[PDB]
Design a protein around this ligand. Structure first.
Ligand SMILES: Nc1ncnc2c1ncn2[C@@H]1O[C@H](COP(=O)(O)OP(=O)(O)O)[C@@H](O)[C@H]1O
Ligand SMILES: Nc1ncnc2c1ncn2[C@@H]1O[C@H](COP(=O)(O)OP(=O)(O)O)[C@@H](O)[C@H]1O
Ligand SMILES: CC(C)(CO)[C@@H](O)C(=O)NCCC(=O)NCc1cccnc1
Ligand SMILES: CC(C)(CO)[C@@H](O)C(=O)NCCC(=O)NCc1cccnc1
Lengths: 309, 309
């Protein structure tokens, strides 16, 4: 019967966009199309604009509270960013969702400065994964420097003036040597990664006792059926392959050299043997820890939103 | 070094205390002494009144956010209780702290109905602990029906009109058969017990993937050094033993039959072998999951309050 979530179907969620009227400007439409050419502006208006408005109500409540607490705390303390996390399967659309929300949240005067950090950067470099026999376990708990990731969000929630994150490139399939990103007290930080709702129980080989989620204000799990995820993963793989036709520095150039059919077979096996296993064992069991679960159907169309009561 | 907690200084804490007329009548003072005869009214003035005032800021902020969200989302607006949890070592004073905060929080017109549930009630009964060889592990993760405790706070955070909890009695050292406490959508529920900051990692014999903390709005860990906890545990034990001098149906009547010196040696060994081991292995490592850490000194006086930034 009753669950910890308010549940919206698409009709009810899209109905929210008039409760408070919002409309994209030309400049914004151009950013959004630059984030993802396949992303529907209709989908932005019906789904992501209401979601950005929902989040502004949460962020605004936090800022009002902070202003009250400053009455006795005093206004000398550090600026602490509001942290939104985005979890879900490999290839469900976390990066797209994060980039879209970054663009939309940047509107509001209360919170113009929005940073985006992906947990990919906190993977151990390939040389270390190789040393440990983990090269086909990339994305599994053992492949992350999870202590460093927890320290990064901890430091942000400690009010450090700057914190630095390592960065990964899907193009070179590795952590970028000397490519670290520095953030400086943003209003919002969006942390995107499959493992953002994981905890010490997922890392029994090297446990931690305070979790990423203990430093996150609001978490979104993007959900979809396995059959869709596989299709989206394979399609994305083929787009990276296309990108590599003329980029011999892409790791995907190895696959550009193969027939499309054989590339598809490789991508299918990577999905089945690595990412699907990761989803079932490590990602999906964390879904019910999210503040909000956003479910997708064919063509990336959101068909359900569930929000913690 | 900065950490995720601000530590109140005397000017900030004074400003919190002085922010309202906290208007304690003679009858209220009498009821507070009824909670614990060794409770200092000076601690109530200097510590518990301001702590409860702090909590009201958080509770009140959450009420107004709920109201904003209800109009935006078009939902009916069922009440969801605000849940405060209180963790810490055996004998640190969780129950006294919980009962004082219950009495003080209920004085605010915005949240007059405050319930208190202890996690002791969710221990497996002695009959079950005996079946599993766990009578000397009472309070350890294996001794709790943890799934049932998570379900209780989950149901509350689902808007169920009523929820039922099993109840424990320290006087018979067991779960009261058919003694269940039913709560009905209070404004606030205080959940008191040593395990409220524990998670799936602490229960590898029977894992859960959504934690008590996932249904708790604000958590307090009451902290004190080991040497004080020990003396407080022993003094309490001796007091229960004294109470049993005239009560043969008390579980502690058993210890009233011993000599005082032997009762003391027994209490000391219970501390050292059961409750202290539990503190080090299972309780203390959860401390930094708390919204607020309240540290106690000699005579139970609070000498430090740390609050998440
Ligand atoms: N809302 C969307 N509309 C259209 N395509 C999308 C959408 N979200 C994701 N995609 C596409 O699906 C694939 C996976 O998205 P991505 O953001 O790369 O996933 P993740 O970051 O979760 O691995 C990509 O090819 C991306 O272009
Ligand atoms: N604030 C306080 N002032 C005086 N005595 C206290 C205070 N808090 C707890 N105590 C005493 O310390 C002992 C432990 O407290 P209790 O509330 O039973 O601990 P817990 O519930 O954490 O096991 C008891 O003897 C109790 O009377
Ligand atoms: C764990 C991630 C970093 C999360 O974003 C995922 O993208 C990944 O590389 N998973 C490992 C399996 C996979 O999809 N590898 C891609 C790949 C690419 C080129 C050659 N072999 C494999
Ligand atoms: C685990 C608790 C239920 C925490 O609420 C604890 O009181 C307890 O029974 N610990 C087991 C060891 C113990 O101290 N047993 C006897 C005892 C029980 C209560 C007070 N003094 C002594």
């Amino acid at each position: 019967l009753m669950t910890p979530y308010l549940q919206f179907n698409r009709h009810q969620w899209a109905a929210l966009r008039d409760s408070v009227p919002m409309t994209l400007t030309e400049d914004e439409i151009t950013r959004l199309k630059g984030i993802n050419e396949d992303l529907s502006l209709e989908e932005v208006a019906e789904i992501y604009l209401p979601l950005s408005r929902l989040l502004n109500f949460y962020i605004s409540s936090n800022l009002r509270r902070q202003a009250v607490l400053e009455q006795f705390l005093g206004t000398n303390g550090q600026r602490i960013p509001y942290i939104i996390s985005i979890a879900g399967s490999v290839a469900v659309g976390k990066s797209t969702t994060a980039r879209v929300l970054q663009a939309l949240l940047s509107r509001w005067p209360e919170h113009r400065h929005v940073e985006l950090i992906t947990t990919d950067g906190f993977l151990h470099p390939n040389s270390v994964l190789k040393e440990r026999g983990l090269m086909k376990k990339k994305g599994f708990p053992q492949s992350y420097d999870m202590h460093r990731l927890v320290k990064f969000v901890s430091d942000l929630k400690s009010g450090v003036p700057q914190a630095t994150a390592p960065v990964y490139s899907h193009l070179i399939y590795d952590v970028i040597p000397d490519g670290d990103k520095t953030v400086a007290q943003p209003d919002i930080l969006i942390l995107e990664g499959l493992n953002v709702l994981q905890s010490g129980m997922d890392y029994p080989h090297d446990p931690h006792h305070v979790f990423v989620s203990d430093f996150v204000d609001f978490s979104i799990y993007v959900d979809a059926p396995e059959e869709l995820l596989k299709s989206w993963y394979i399609n994305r793989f083929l787009k990276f392959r296309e990108g590599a036709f003329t980029d011999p520095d892409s790791y995907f150039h190895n696959y550009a050299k193969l027939s499309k059919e054989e590339a598809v077979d490789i991508a299918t096996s990577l999905w089945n043997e690595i990412n699907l296993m990761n989803l079932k064992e490590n990602i999906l069991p964390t879904r019910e820890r999210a503040s909000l679960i956003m479910t997708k159907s064919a063509n990336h169309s959101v068909n359900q939103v569930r929000l913690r009561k």
